[PDB]
């Protein structure tokens, strides 16, 4: 692999993430209908970023 | 449960920093007026937004 002399920037502007800190709740109607998602301060935040 | 929204404004003096209880407006989002000390209960606390 040969290094060239070109560089670039990537912009990934602010993310929204709110919900219940304890568990997740779902609908009484179905069982796959999420209502507010479980998000805590202990969750494994893993990102999957594409590249052009 | 009321939905949460990200507001942003200008800091003026007399207003307080966060005290570990969430950067939010305690006056309109609480009703009991009995969850925080009396210093911040009728006001809102702010915090910087360094990346913005």
Distances, alpha carbon A18 to alpha carbons A6, A10, B5, B24, in Å: 38, 25, 10, 14
Among A15, A51, A46, A26, which residue's Cα sits nearest to residue B51? Answer: A15
* Cβ atoms within 10 Å, residue A19: 16
Task: Please name which of B50, B52, B47 lies closest in space to residue B20, comparing C-alpha atoms.
Answer: B47
For A35, nearest residue in chain B (alpha carbons): B1
Q: How far apart are CA B33 and CA B41, in angstroms?
A: 6
The CA distance from A3 to the nearest CA of chain B, in Å, is 31
Distance CA A14, CA B23 (A): 17
Technique used: cryo-EM
Going by their DSSP bridges, the two strands A25-26 and A34-36 should be labelled as antiparallel
Residue (of A36, A18, A12) closest to B23 by Cα position: A18
Closest alpha carbon within chain B to A17: B4
The answer to whether A14 contacts chain B (CB < 8 Å) is yes
Name beta bridge partners: B9.
Answer: none
User: CA B22, CA B26: separation in Å to the nearest integer?
Assistant: 9
Resolution of the model in angstroms: 4.2
B28-46 b/e with 16+ CB inside 10 Å = b?
A: eeeeeeeeeeeebeeebbb
| Six-digit token string for B10 | 């200008």
Helices and strands (H and E) in chain B: how many: 1, 2
């Amino acid at each position: 692999v040969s290094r060239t002399s070109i560089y670039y920037y990537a912009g990934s502007s602010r993310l929204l993430a709110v919900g219940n800190p304890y568990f997740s709740i779902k609908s009484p109607n179905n069982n796959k209908k999420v209502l507010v998602p479980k998000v805590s301060g202990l969750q494994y935040r893993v990102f999957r970023v594409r590249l052009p | 449960c009321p939905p949460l929204e990200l507001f942003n404004s200008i800091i003026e003096d007399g207003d307080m920093v966060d005290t570990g209880f969430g950067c939010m407006d305690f006056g309109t989002l609480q009703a009991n007026k009995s969850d925080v000390p009396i210093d911040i209960c009728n006001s809102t606390c702010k915090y910087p937004d360094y990346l913005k």
